[PDB]
Amino acid sequence: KTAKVGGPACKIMGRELDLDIVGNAESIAAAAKEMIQVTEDDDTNVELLGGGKRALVQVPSARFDVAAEYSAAPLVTATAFVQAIINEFDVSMYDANMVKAAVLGRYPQS
Amino acid sequence: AKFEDKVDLYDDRGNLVEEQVPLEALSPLRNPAIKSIVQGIKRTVAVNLEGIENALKTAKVGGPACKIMGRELDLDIVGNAESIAAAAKEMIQVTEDDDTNVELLGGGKRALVQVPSARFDVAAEYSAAPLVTATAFVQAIINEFDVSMYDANMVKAAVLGRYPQSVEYMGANIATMLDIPQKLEGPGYALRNIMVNHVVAATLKNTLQAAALSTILEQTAMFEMGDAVGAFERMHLLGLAYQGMNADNLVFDLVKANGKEGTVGSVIADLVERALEDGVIKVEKELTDYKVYGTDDLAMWNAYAAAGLMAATMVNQGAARAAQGVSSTLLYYNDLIEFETGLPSVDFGKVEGTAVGFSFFSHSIYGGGGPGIFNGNHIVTRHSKGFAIPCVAAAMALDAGTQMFSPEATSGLIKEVFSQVDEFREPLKYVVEAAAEIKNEI
Amino acid sequence: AQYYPGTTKVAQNRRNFCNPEYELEKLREISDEDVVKILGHRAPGEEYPSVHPPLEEMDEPEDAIREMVEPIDGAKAGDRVRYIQFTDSMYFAPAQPYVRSRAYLCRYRGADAGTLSGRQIIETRERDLEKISKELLETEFFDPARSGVRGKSVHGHSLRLDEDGMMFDMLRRQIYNKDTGRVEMVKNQIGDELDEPVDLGEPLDEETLMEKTTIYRVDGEAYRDDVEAVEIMQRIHVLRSQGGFN
Amino acid sequence: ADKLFINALKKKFEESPEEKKTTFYTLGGWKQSERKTEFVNAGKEVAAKRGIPQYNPDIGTPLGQRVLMPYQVSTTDTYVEGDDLHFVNNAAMQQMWDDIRRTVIVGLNHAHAVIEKRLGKEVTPETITHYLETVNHAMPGAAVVQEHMVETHPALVADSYVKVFTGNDEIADEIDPAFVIDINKQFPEDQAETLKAEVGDGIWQVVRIPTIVSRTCDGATTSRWSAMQIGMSMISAYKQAAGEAATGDFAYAAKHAEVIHMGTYLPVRRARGENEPGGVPFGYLADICQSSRVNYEDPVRVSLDVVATGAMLYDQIWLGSYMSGGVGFTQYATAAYTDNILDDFTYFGKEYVEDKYGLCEAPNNMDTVLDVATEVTFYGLEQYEEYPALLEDQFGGSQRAAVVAAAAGCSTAFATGNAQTGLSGWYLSMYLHKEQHSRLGFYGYDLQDQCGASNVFSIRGDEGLPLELRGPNYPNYAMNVGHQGEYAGISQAPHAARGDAFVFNPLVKIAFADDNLVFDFTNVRGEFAKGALREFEPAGERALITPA
Amino acid sequence: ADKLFINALKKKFEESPEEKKTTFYTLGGWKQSERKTEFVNAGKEVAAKRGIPQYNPDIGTPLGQRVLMPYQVSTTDTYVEGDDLHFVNNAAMQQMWDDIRRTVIVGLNHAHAVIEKRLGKEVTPETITHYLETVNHAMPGAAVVQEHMVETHPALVADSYVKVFTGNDEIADEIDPAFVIDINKQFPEDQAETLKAEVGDGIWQVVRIPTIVSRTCDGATTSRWSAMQIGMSMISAYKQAAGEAATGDFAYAAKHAEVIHMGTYLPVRRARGENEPGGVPFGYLADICQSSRVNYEDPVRVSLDVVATGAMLYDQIWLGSYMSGGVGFTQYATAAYTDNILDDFTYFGKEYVEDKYGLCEAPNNMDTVLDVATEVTFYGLEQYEEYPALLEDQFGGSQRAAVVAAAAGCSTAFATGNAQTGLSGWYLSMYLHKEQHSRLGFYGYDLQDQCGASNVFSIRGDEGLPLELRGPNYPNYAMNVGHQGEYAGISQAPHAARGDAFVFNPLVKIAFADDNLVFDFTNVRGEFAKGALREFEPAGERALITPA
Numbered sequence A: 001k002t003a004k005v006g007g008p009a010c011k012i013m014g015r016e017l018d019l020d021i022v023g024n025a026e027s028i029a030a031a032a033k034e035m036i037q038v039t040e041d042d043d044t045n046v047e048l049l050g051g052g053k054r055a056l057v058q059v060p061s062a063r064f065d066v067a068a069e070y071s072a073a074p075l076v077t078a079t080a081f082v083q084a085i086i087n088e089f090d091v092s093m094y095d096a097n098m099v100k101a102a103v104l105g106r107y108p109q110s
Numbered sequence B: 001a002k003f004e005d006k007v008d009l010y011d012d013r014g015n016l017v018e019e020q021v022p023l024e025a026l027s028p029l030r031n032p033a034i035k036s037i038v039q040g041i042k043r044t045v046a047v048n049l050e051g052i053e054n055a056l057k058t059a060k061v062g063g064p065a066c067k068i069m070g071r072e073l074d075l076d077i078v079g080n081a082e083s084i085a086a087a088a089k090e091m092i093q094v095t096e097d098d099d100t101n102v103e104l105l106g107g108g109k110r111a112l113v114q115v116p117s118a119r120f121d122v123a124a125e126y127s128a129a130p131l132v133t134a135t136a137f138v139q140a141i142i143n144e145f146d147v148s149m150y151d152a153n154m155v156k157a158a159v160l161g162r163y164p165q166s167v168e169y170m171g172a173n174i175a176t177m178l179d180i181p182q183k184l185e186g187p188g189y190a191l192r193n194i195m196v197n198h199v200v201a202a203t204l205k206n207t208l209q210a211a212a213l214s215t216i217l218e219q220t221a222m223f224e225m226g227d228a229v230g231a232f233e234r235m236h237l238l239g240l241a242y243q244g245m246n247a248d249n250l251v252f253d254l255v256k257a258n259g260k261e262g263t264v265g266s267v268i269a270d271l272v273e274r275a276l277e278d279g280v281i282k283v284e285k286e287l288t289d290y291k292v293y294g295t296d297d298l299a300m301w302n303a304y305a306a307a308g309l310m311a312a313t314m315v316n317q318g319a320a321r322a323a324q325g326v327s328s329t330l331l332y333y334n335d336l337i338e339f340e341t342g343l344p345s346v347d348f349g350k351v352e353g354t355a356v357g358f359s360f361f362s363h364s365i366y367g368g369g370g371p372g373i374f375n376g377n378h379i380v381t382r383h384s385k386g387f388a389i390p391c392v393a394a395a396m397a398l399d400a401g402t403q404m405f406s407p408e409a410t411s412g413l414i415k416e417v418f419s420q421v422d423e424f425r426e427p428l429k430y431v432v433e434a435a436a437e438i439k440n441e442i
Numbered sequence C: 001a002q003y004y005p006g007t008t009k010v011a012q013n014r015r016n017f018c019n020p021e022y023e024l025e026k027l028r029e030i031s032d033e034d035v036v037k038i039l040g041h042r043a044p045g046e047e048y049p050s051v052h053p054p055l056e057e058m059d060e061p062e063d064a065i066r067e068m069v070e071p072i073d074g075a076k077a078g079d080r081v082r083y084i085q086f087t088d089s090m091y092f093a094p095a096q097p098y099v100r101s102r103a104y105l106c107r108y109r110g111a112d113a114g115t116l117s118g119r120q121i122i123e124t125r126e127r128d129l130e131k132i133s134k135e136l137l138e139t140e141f142f143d144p145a146r147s148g149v150r151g152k153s154v155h156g157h158s159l160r161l162d163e164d165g166m167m168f169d170m171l172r173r174q175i176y177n178k179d180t181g182r183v184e185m186v187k188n189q190i191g192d193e194l195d196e197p198v199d200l201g202e203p204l205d206e207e208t209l210m211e212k213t214t215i216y217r218v219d220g221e222a223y224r225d226d227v228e229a230v231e232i233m234q235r236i237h238v239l240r241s242q243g244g245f246n
Numbered sequence D, E: 001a002d003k004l005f006i007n008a009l010k011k012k013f014e015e016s017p018e019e020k021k022t023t024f025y026t027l028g029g030w031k032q033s034e035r036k037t038e039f040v041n042a043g044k045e046v047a048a049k050r051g052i053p054q055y056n057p058d059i060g061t062p063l064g065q066r067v068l069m070p071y072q073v074s075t076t077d078t079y080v081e082g083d084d085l086h087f088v089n090n091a092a093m094q095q096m097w098d099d100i101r102r103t104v105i106v107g108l109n110h111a112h113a114v115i116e117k118r119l120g121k122e123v124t125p126e127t128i129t130h131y132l133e134t135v136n137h138a139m140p141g142a143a144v145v146q147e148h149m150v151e152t153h154p155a156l157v158a159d160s161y162v163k164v165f166t167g168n169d170e171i172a173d174e175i176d177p178a179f180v181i182d183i184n185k186q187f188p189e190d191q192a193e194t195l196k197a198e199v200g201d202g203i204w205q206v207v208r209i210p211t212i213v214s215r216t217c218d219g220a221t222t223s224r225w226s227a228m229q230i231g232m233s234m235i236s237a238y239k240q241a242a243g244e245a246a247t248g249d250f251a252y253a254a255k256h257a258e259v260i261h262m263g264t265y266l267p268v269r270r271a272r273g274e275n276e277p278g279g280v281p282f283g284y285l286a287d288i289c290q291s292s293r294v295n296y297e298d299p300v301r302v303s304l305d306v307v308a309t310g311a312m313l314y315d316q317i318w319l320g321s322y323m324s325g326g327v328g329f330t331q332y333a334t335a336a337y338t339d340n341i342l343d344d345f346t347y348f349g350k351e352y353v354e355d356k357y358g359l360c361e362a363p364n365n366m367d368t369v370l371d372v373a374t375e376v377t378f379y380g381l382e383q384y385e386e387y388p389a390l391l392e393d394q395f396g397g398s399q400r401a402a403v404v405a406a407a408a409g410c411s412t413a414f415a416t417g418n419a420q421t422g423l424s425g426w427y428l429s430m431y432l433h434k435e436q437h438s439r440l441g442f443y444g445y446d447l448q449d450q451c452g453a454s455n456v457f458s459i460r461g462d463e464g465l466p467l468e469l470r471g472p473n474y475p476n477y478a479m480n481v482g483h484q485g486e487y488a489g490i491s492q493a494p495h496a497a498r499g500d501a502f503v504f505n506p507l508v509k510i511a512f513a514d515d516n517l518v519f520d521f522t523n524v525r526g527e528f529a530k531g532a533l534r535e536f537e538p539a540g541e542r543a544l545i546t547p548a
């Protein structure tokens, strides 16, 4: 809502998006969990905290037994939440990069 | 199943093996042979016992041209390889009947080592393979010869190099297909930082097997990077099946039809005709003497065009028996097919873009080198999400000896060790067999 | 195959260079020895050097792909990979850089083609390169005033022509003869003097340059007026954009 | 009036600019050139003094078979040979990079909280002024606590100092004004109010370390050097023990918790620490350039002063030396800041957008991208066809691709007020240009160009990012000339058309609004011309400590 | 005879060096010093010129309540205030680092093989001399193939060039001597024998890029700049297409497969590319210093010339600036190269070992470490107790810990002929000194000292390494002053006592045997004195392109 993305004190004037993410947390979390999991009822956990302000996410262990390392946890979680937010609000192609910036920051420039 | 698609699976001779296999039975997240290949490559190390012994004898440790006069140690390591390897294995294993493997090769000059899978399930990443291997061999050589406290640091230098003054194991006499985690261009990239010449060495230059190993590594990294999550998953799986696994025998039959006299352009004509015949594309609009094609399934059009791209590389660089033109094939197969059809090229331009910079960095003064030294983590060739590098591995398999930096030059230690492992050498076989085994679990 | 959209002479010429069924017009006759001298890689009567042994001498394992793909003749022999590179004036040369790389991968086997603004190159096995080079130098791929064979010092695609209608060449490899109206090649493509010059024939006149060119320009046919070609380019832009998002 | 580049084409060649024919090979090669002639003589002297051959005009091929051209520095009346715009030969270009490399922004907010909470001491404007007098003794390399310290010569480090800024005007006016970047003096009213609202009651230092140290060392020295002397001055001015546990909170705050680097560090294949050119994001480079606070009535001038800043830094110093070297990439960059060429194309596009939509009033969508970027691309390319002298001037296709696409992408963003659709118009320009002329740039120029359309609006891990957050380490952009400084201009374009005070970081924008810098960031192209004329005076020279 | 430090102590103070008492507080503070008075006057002129307060003697505490001492540069008769040995004020120290940073070693072996196999072309002494004339035009930034290139000013880059060396006398004797580092001329016969055997028939380039570019940019620029211009000169000299597939094998060889960097890249917390000081191993620093080929009959002088080289680079520029900054660490390093103090102690230890064991004839074991390192530690400590003026001169405990342990460690290695037992001697000296005086160094001095004994002979992953392969990035050594240059001297010590031509890399040793360097690496301490006197002439300045 403030377009404050990409690191300390950063802001892009004109890029603000006013989306009710916390009010629709349940639906967004469910949508993200369906992308995160490998099969229904595996060891994926997505639990809301703080009246929908936060989520605990545990990416399924199986994704790790076919990975070299551990970065699939932030990277699969980030992209599942980005896609679930875009899909919740039908964010357009032109604006969706700001959802990506708000979730994962200035990566991969940083 | 999340997806309804099925594919027919073949062997590297173009014969059918298994019909109507659900697409997800080839996913790295489900197929047990992909899991065993990836866990195998995380835990496999090649040890050059000859090389350790020669570095010690000459005191040539710590990187190119380095030597410490007065530190020479003459130890009969290859003569006592059997006892040194057994002593190493006892420190490497967790229990006596686990999946630790230590096997001498070349009369004791080399050892193939597979560190137990268990050490990995309690590790963050994969560096326990070279680090547990290197210390077990350092300690087994010291204990074999009773090397003194004053001299033992030379055995460490001969095995692992200038580390930790250098970040890499500079001068080491051990090798792995993976490289250190600090060299990743982004998080999730480690299965991409595997030199093309090491995949070609491991598969003994079998074209289809090198393309399948490379595709399995690239597309498994696309899952670890989150690229194959949600909207994009099916595109990645169909790419893996059609470009890397010869699904439907599409790559094989294109090469069969264009191998005698064909060009990149003739393979393109055949692939567009096959896509039309299968209903993947259809004529949307007529302009003046020019049909504009459309598709209601972008992931499948992309997969079919990816299989054509692999066939075009095999036909173009197979005909020259020279790998350098794979950079041009990757560019112009995609540039030609978009003006032939009105539809977007493989990976929506990203293969074409990777091939522009790869052609520059393999024909100019600024960096890069021949095709064999690239990889999915190299800055020039990271951009397409798994659809470019497998073609470079097919091209290098087909090269008859035009490269200075050939797999014989860069990858001889990796060849000797890693080609011993059946699932690394012949992955197409094992991943097909596993997909048939789990076909009713999807 | 359709090759390229559009309703201009330029569009049709782009399709004809790609289409291997289209017979390229032959404009000039050059001997085999003179193709070898212009390439500059070996002297007349020198054996093809090798980069590796003949394929029949090597012991290759069973590979269905190698068995299905016939090697070109210079690959069977083990010949070096060498090149030929051309520069094309933007004042209506008949071939132009992308047109060359696209056409070379439709017409020719085992080809490594590279495109740049001021040079365009093909690398392949030496004896096969000599056969392709004769076709590139004798036909309408080449005009001896508006195109140049140049392995270095390529400047001139974007320069004004001289008073003879010749493109600039820092190394003056192609010299216009006012007495014949014909151009001679006096140096090989890397700039070394030839013992005897090669006749490259007369430059194409302005009307025939306009008939055969594949560049769009406001003073010929403008791309913005070939509205079906611009439609396909804009469609590819939009489809790539949408595909990359979702 | 004439096209803006006509005067320069009439200066370069004897023919009128529309004339298709000329004559070559008659100018005596290098001997036509004042600069080449100076170089041949200097090479003779260098090789004789050292006993090793060096510059020799007869090695390789002979330059100057065609005219060796002068170039107009755009916005000026200065014409120089292009050697005078090589970064090695231009002290203003070297100082522009030294002034960025040696700057860091360092908060005082955590620091003042540590003094009030841990030490239990009060902070006021007076205590801030006493700390600023102390740190302006210490920062250039002089002692405040220990006996028998040996120190830097004050005149070798005269360019090093610390200033502050805050959005609270009454606190700003209570600190001694020798130390304060005055937001209301340096910015017009509406931009001053925007910037002061962003900063609020925050108080930030702008620290500049010595150019002679930056040149001896590297960019990652800057935030460490700054923190050592902030730490000594906090000890001295607030009466700490000289090294107690609380001393480490000032260190962590100055080196990590409240620091803004100009650049972030790079990955191992191109390893570099902080404050190197590859880490500087495009939005920060637009903010460092100060044209936005002086030429705000003219969004084209603001956007193209950012393109000049970025083309020189990113292509000549960064890609042409840090990532390559040699003769390098002078004219790949000069194409974007000489002969008023990109200026003519971008004014055309701004006027087109004004007439059809109004600035910032077009729909932010693909129909606007297709309309504006295609129109502007065809105007630029028609200029090279109508004027053969223009085509012989920008003789490399990459230089034409960068200039035409920069005008098309800036004009798209003037229409939508959004940099992302500006960036899509840059890529469509390249595709249209490639089909029009059957060529685009050098062998490797359109790696990012062919990945470009699909990555503009992607949201994936290493693909998706607003253009202001991208920079020379965005993966597709990490290698090639002729793009990075134009993307900094496209990032500036919508915000100049909207009248925004900054593009990506308001602290960066204020930190360069300071006439104590050695380079004048308000007039980047004027400074480049002053350095080409050998009239710029850099910091960091060693004359004071070497023989007369 | 007088201890070696007596003349310097007699010049510093009016009292004889044995006297216990003095008087303080009557010298007028900073007014006693020529250099401090220069600095006060320059701060006032700087502050007025720029409108911001700067150097002021009345800020913080008043220097000079005691004598502000002169220092003798060891092995010279030059006495200077310590400010003249600060790296900012000493152009010889800055040039020493520039000459290392701008050098890379690049083989011609792979490149000659690409020419013979891929291109089918011959390589001869003739084609090599032609190539060297070409690369000596190209390397400083001049063109060999394209038209309309703009180039560096030859006189700004007069310090850049390319030489070659080879162990094959018949090639080396046939090339123009202008391009050859002649091993037989530069090295005494037995060392020349050893070095030519290590090189064999290999042919290696020593490439020096321009100091003005190294200073604008960074160390990771050197091997890229080098490879660009080797690549151009291979095209021009061997008649390749100017950009064909074989061109890429010359790039890969020049940047990766046959390159020797002076330093390797660093991890992210201290992120830096290649050719930065933290990546230079101790054995390479010893081989960069050229004292071993001039002063070989005196192993103490060779070892202490390496200690001077490394104390200055690793403590003053690297740890004192790159990793910290400010006033920095001049006198932590001057302790190791002034007043002949480390020389006195090390000459004592050498004589002790030569009389007891004979050089390199003691057993290589802990009994020899216990004997020699304890004897020499007690000798050095007794000098500070016997000479109150010596203790007041090296007033900081870290200075005394580094000097005493350097002498103990070098002397242990002169006994054993092995650097690892010399390193164990260095740690034992630290433990004995800490117990003798109930103090050692600064708060953090003996991090590596207390890990030290246990890590000297460890073989574990990030612990075990021969001392020649360690450097500033060995984990325990990454942070702290007063160790790294001394370890380079211990690495040199056993090899100087053995008569070895090099310590760790013969190509590095030969690469600095060159009088066309700007700094004279055969006489590092002499050079430091010349720069302190303002008599050294560096490269890199911009005077030719700035106003008078």
Ligand code: F43
Binding pocket: B363, B364, B365, B366, C116, C117, C118, C119, C151, C152, C153, C154, C155, C156, C157, C158, D325, D326, D327, D328, D329, D330, D331, D332, D333, D395, D396, D397, D398, D399, D440, D441, D442, D443, E142, E143, E144, E145, E146, E147, E149, E150, E228, E229, E232, E235, E242, E243
């Ligand atoms: C050897 C290469 C291959 C390679 O890896 N780099 C080269 C050469 C290199 C050298 C040329 C210096 C010299 O002459 O010694 C330098 C200056 C880099 C360096 N090592 O300092 C350079 N190119 Ni190049 N290079 C350039 C360009 C170009 C254009 C020139 C086209 C023309 O018609 O003149 C073409 C690519 C294309 O066709 O698009 C080009 C090619 C080439 N480029 C061909 C040589 C072409 C020839 O044989 O003449 N550059 C440009 O298009 C403009 C900017 C220009 C750069 C110098 C500057 O920016 O001032 C220079 C940048």
Ligand SMILES: C[C@@H](OP(=O)(O)O)[C@H](NC(=O)CCCCCCS)C(=O)O
Binding pocket: B361, B366, B367, B368, B369, B379, B380, D269, D270, D319, D320, D323, D324, D444, D478, D479, D480, D481, E224, E255
């Ligand atoms: C590709 C990579 O080089 P390597 O393949 O790692 O040798 C890289 N150079 C570059 O990106 C060169 C870019 C600058 C010169 C070309 C500009 S178009 C680098 O050195 O890290």
Ligand SMILES: O=S(=O)(O)CCS
Binding pocket: B360, B363, B364, B365, C116, D442, D443, D444, E243
């Ligand atoms: O000719 S190349 O495109 O490789 C280099 C252009 S500077």
Ligand SMILES: O=S(=O)(O)CCS
Binding pocket: D243, E442, E443, E444
């Ligand atoms: O006092 S501390 O040991 O922290 C610093 C010494 S420079």
Ligand SMILES: [Mg+2]
Binding pocket: B286, B289, B290
């Ligand atoms: Mg029809």
Ligand SMILES: [Mg+2]
Binding pocket: C029, C030, C031, C032
């Ligand atoms: Mg004939």
Ligand SMILES: [Mg+2]
Binding pocket: none
């Ligand atoms: Mg119109």
Ligand SMILES: [Mg+2]
Binding pocket: D515, D520
């Ligand atoms: Mg000013």
Ligand SMILES: [Mg+2]
Binding pocket: E515, E520
């Ligand atoms: Mg000298």
Ligand SMILES: [Mg+2]
Binding pocket: E518, E520
């Ligand atoms: Mg001298």
Ligand SMILES: [Zn+2]
Binding pocket: D214, D215, D216, D217, D218, E214, E215, E216, E217, E218
């Ligand atoms: Zn620097």
